[PDB]
């Protein structure tokens, strides 16, 4: 029942065969840049100049 970041099918996160050549890692890295933007933006726009 656990939520799956990369889907729950077993061992579908078997990241052999190249570090970044996996069907899921690309999405995650793209999400990392988006999360970074939101966090920095919220902290500098919750005060204002």
């Amino acid at each position: 029942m656990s939520l799956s970041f990369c889907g729950n099918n077993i061992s579908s996160y078997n990241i052999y065969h190249g570090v970044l050549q996996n069907p899921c890692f690309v999405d995650a890295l793209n999400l990392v840049p988006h999360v970074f933007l939101l966090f920095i933006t919220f902290p500098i726009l919750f005060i204002g100049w």
């Binding site: 077993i10 990241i15 995650a28 919750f46």
Partner: protein
């Protein structure tokens, strides 16, 4: 005082009875608002806003570096090594789970 009624604007009030300097500066050489200015606004906040910025900052830092750690424990082939339920954790010892 209808003349004064229409003269409500025409009035020699250099400083308002409150005390402020009711004036108007213009045509000045505003160089900008350099970064450090924002930090000064951080000092002169009120308690509700200071508490909010405090807690929000701590939580944002925690979540951000947690996301980073999540990626790290992903790339090292760690989450998969744990997900292998052949045993309670069959080959999870030698694979050097990057973060235990």
């Amino acid at each position: 005082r209808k003349p004064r009624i229409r003269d409500r604007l025409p009035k020699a009030r250099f400083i308002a009875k409150s005390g402020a300097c009711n004036l108007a500066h213009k045509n000045i050489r505003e160089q900008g608002r350099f970064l450090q200015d924002i930090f000064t606004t951080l000092v002169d906040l009120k308690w509700r806003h200071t508490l909010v910025i405090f807690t929000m900052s701590f939580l944002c830092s925690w979540l951000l570096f947690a996301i980073m750690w999540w990626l790290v424990a992903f790339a090292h082939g760690d989450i998969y090594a744990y997900m292998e339920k052949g045993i309670t954790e069959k080959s999870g010892l030698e694979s050097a789970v990057c973060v235990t």
